[PDB]
Amino acid sequence: SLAGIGLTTTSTFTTAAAAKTMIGTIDTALQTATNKLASLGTSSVGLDTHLTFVG
Amino acid sequence: NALKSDFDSLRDQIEKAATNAKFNGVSIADGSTTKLTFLANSDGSGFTVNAKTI
Numbered sequence A: 001s002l003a004g005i006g007l008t009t010t011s012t013f014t015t016a017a018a019a020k021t022m023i024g025t026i027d028t029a030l031q032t033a034t035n036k037l038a039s040l041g042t043s044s045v046g047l048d049t050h051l052t053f054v055g
Numbered sequence B: 001n002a003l004k005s006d007f008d009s010l011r012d013q014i015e016k017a018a019t020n021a022k023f024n025g026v027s028i029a030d031g032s033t034t035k036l037t038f039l040a041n042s043d044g045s046g047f048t049v050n051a052k053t054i
Helices: A018-054 B002-019
Strands: B035-039 B046-050
Touching: none
Parallel strands: none
Antiparallel strands: B035 B046
């Protein structure tokens, strides 16, 4: 969620200079979001493997 | 007097021709601003074009 990735809701850029830092903020947000989703995918594969073994 | 009036007309013409050269409200020939910065990199770094008032 917006708090989770550090975006901070109701956070915009009022001038043409805050956008120069918003670029980097969105880059970091995208990086950490993709990392979290990769971890979730790994966990799902683990669940599948253990289910097979339990069978 | 005729040559002076010709001179004055041509000067007024230069002024009109100079102040009308705006695209989208922004221009680099009137002298309104000191420089224009465009995007040049996917991270925000800019391409700088100084202003050349004419």
